[PDB]
């Protein structure tokens, strides 16, 4: 059949390229889908695609993805239902739906095996992002249209006056509201254990950027500001095991104690630091900010940069590792993020020119930009004092 | 470039087939996307694809899609913002996101024109379907995971005990509650103006099913039970304009009122009738139920059928026009519908065997099954007395 032939050739093209080529193919397949659906199909697609997150959250509550990924033969719906404690008819209907969207696979004797998506949802860090989206993002998006209608469609600029405050009936911003929320801290801390791949070290020419700087007598090579579990520090020490200089993970105390389990015995310091205060480490080569500034409106993002600038020597650099969407033709993964951080945080995705304008207000100029993902661009941008 | 070549060749294959083949290709493109995405891509897709309904809702509130679909030239974001009463920065970011998911088209000089999806969302009945998804379906899906956990995963069979009651904090079932909400019933009435295509008359062998039936003296040929705007009656009269016999649209008076604008001035009777009460028309050739019975659990669906059966002749037929999902390999459109109607109405999609089991409890037997859509199957099922 022509359908089998299409799948075979796209599969073969996909395996004949790298992860960025496969991402480009997937965006093309998505664009083809939208161009080819009928009007009624469009409305059905938009209506039913919301089911995926709800049904993933149920499968996660039942432990279904973890169980199915460990099974060694196809499982019947009754076997899964009786094992996980689910009603037989309910489980059979959830599995039929999951099979239709490849969350599981259905065999021709109507049994079930894991798919690539089953394996994904069984990973704690990824499972946690799905649960984050259901419990924290969905309420904000559900509130955005009426929030904007009430306020007469304002440009959102303040983290304490956006859809989040209407959706959760609070007056705090996300950061502070979450502390008051037991169940959501546990999922968030699990979320921080996910490590995105690839990372900036795949294209960052660290030796070229070192240049005229010296680690002697005891200077810091790398200060990871808000570095979470410290994945950037770990990958840096791993890739450049012979480069001298302190490598310092900076974050809040509760996150730093969680990171102790995973950090190496030696080579990475843990330093409690609130990045809304002056940077304590002086003259470091790289002050590193990964997925930090995108969570803040320009006013607060600027204050974070101004808190680092007085610690910089002439050879110091601020490295912002973040999304850099293009000026036109932006893709859904970076425009969707923009709407979400608008609605929850009052912040925004920034083009290269918007990053430069923000950094110029802190006294900085862009020296170099090292993309490491495509077609949705994440880049390490290297800034020095003007 | 490979991506351009894939789009060219899929587009050419799509143009060469019919709507059923294009739907087959679209399901295959979806399956390829899901198998080719990375684990991180899966979570981002699940997370962000719900932005689409939220942003469509906003563009609907602003009249954006209706406006853009009437525009004779590309519009800048500033021109749209100022025309529609939206903040310029807000409108720019919404348009960028809409273009990235083909809800509009962005030009090379960063202006905006209608896409196929813009035109769809400008259609009142299709727009109303999207607004229904946002305001009615979304809160029920949002409530389903916690509802199932509280009741430890029951099999849902009661229309007054499902996620709908939790989501809207009421003890009414969905049908009664909707009537007490003026803006929601108003949207619903616009929703009824959308006419699905193709319809059952494309494969229904009317003359063979009629045989020698005579309309003499006063008999009805076609009774459209819960017929809405009467599309099935209108199409029947248009395709067989010389077939004698009355054609009767039965619904509740508020819906029949909205139908008068569209009905032909002669040939179709509007008869108020509650299908939970005994059927007034005796001895009709066809009692027609399109997309009625899937809205009810088996007990209440049985009673609707039992209200008709005493009116039937030996020649009378009940025609159920509804989804007939396969025993295996069902598609996302028909399984996702099953999960939505579970959560909001306590009902279910039914396989052919499940329809026959239900209809036998009313003393009916299946005589013919006429599919008219593929690969998601809708069929007219013709039942007679045992
Ligand atoms: N005021 C503050 N001072 C220092 N760290 C903060 C902070 N507010 C939030 N954070 C931290 O900022 C991080 C945001 S997510 C961390 C992402 C990390 N840079 C990475 O790419 O791996 C969290 O670890 C959180 O604990
Ligand atoms: N108790 C009742 N008696 C008669 N009609 C009812 C009813 N409850 C709901 N309805 C009607 O049933 C219809 C369901 S949707 C309409 C579907 C229609 N058969 C078609 O496909 O074209 C609505 O028009 C609604 O007004």
Swiss-Prot record, chains A, B:
Disruption phenotype: Resulted in about a 5-fold reduction in leporin C accumulation while leporin B is not detected. Its EC number is 2.1.1.-. The keyword Ion transport does not apply. S-adenosyl-L-methionine binds at residues 226-227, 251, 274-275, 290. One of its GO terms (biological process) is secondary metabolite biosynthetic process. Disulfide bonds: none annotated. Pfam families: Dimerisation (PF08100), Methyltransf_2 (PF00891). Substrate binds at residues 134-147. Residues 174-194 are annotated as: Substrate binding. GO terms for molecular function: O-methyltransferase activity; protein dimerization activity. InterPro entries: COMT-like, O_MeTrfase_dom, Plant_O-MeTrfase_dimerisation, SAM-dependent_MTases_sf, WH-like_DNA-bd_sf, WH_DNA-bd_sf. It is an enzyme of class 2 (transferase). O-methyltransferase; part of the gene cluster 23 that mediates the biosynthesis of a family of 2-pyridones known as leporins. The hybrid PKS-NRPS synthetase lepA and the enoyl reductase lepG are responsible for fusion of phenylalanine with a hexaketide and subsequent release of the stable tetramic acid precursor, pre-leporin C. Because lepA lacks a designated enoylreductase (ER) domain, the required activity is provided the enoyl reductase lepG. It is possible that the dehydrogenase lepF also participates in production of pre-leporin C. Belongs to the class I-like SAM-binding methyltransferase superfamily. Cation-independent O-methyltransferase family. This is O-methyltransferase lepI. It comes from Aspergillus flavus (strain ATCC 200026 / FGSC A1120 / IAM 13836 / NRRL 3357 / JCM 12722 / SRRC 167).
């Amino acid at each position: 059949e022509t359908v089998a032939a299409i799948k075979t050739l796209i599969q073969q093209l996909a395996q004949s390229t790298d992860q960025f080529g496969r991402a480009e193919i997937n965006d093309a397949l998505r664009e083809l889908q939208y161009s080819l659906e009928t009007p009624f199909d469009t409305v059905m697609r938009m209506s039913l695609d919301t089911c995926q997150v709800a049904v993933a959250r149920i499968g996660s509550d039942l432990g279904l993805f973890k169980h199915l990924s460990q099974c060694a033969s196809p499982q019947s719906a009754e076997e899964l239902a009786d094992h996980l404690g689910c009603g037989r008819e309910l489980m059979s209907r959830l599995l039929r739906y999951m099979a239709s969207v490849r969350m599981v696979q259905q065999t021709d004797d109507i049994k079930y095996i894991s798919s690539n998506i089953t394996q994904t949802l069984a990973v704690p860090g990824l499972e946690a992002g799905m649960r984050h989206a259901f419990e924290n993002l969905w309420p904000v998006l559900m509130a955005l249209p009426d929030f904007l209608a009430e306020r007469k469609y304002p440009d959102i600029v303040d983290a304490k006056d956006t859809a989040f405050q209407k959706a959760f009936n609070t007056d705090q911003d996300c950061f502070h509201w979450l502390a008051t929320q037991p169940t959501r801290i546990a999922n968030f801390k699990v979320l921080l254990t996910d490590e995105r791949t690839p990372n900036f070290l795949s294209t960052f020419p660290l030796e070229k950027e070192l240049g005229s700087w010296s680690a002697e007598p005891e200077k810091a090579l790398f200060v990871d500001i808000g570095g979470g579990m410290g994945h950037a520090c770990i990958r840096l020490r791993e890739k450049y095991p012979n480069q001298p200089g302190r490598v310092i993970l900076q974050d809040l105390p509760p996150v730093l104690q969680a990171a102790q389990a995973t950090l190496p015995l030696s080579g990475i310091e843990s330093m409690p630091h609130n990045f809304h205060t002056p940077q304590p480490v002086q003259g470091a080569k790289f002050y590193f900010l990964r997925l930090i500034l995108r969570d803040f409106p320009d006013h607060q993002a600027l204050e974070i940069l101004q808190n680092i600038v007085p610690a910089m020597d002439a050879e110091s650099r601020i490295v912002i590792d973040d999304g850099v969407p293009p000026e036109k033709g932006a893709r859904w993964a970076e425009t969707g993020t923009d709407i979400c951080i608008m609605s929850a945080l009052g912040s925004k995705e920034r083009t290269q020119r918007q990053w430069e304008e923000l950094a110029a207000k802190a006294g900085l100029q862009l020296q170099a930009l090292y993309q490491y993902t495509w077609p949705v661009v994440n880049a390490a941008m290297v800034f020095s004092l003007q």
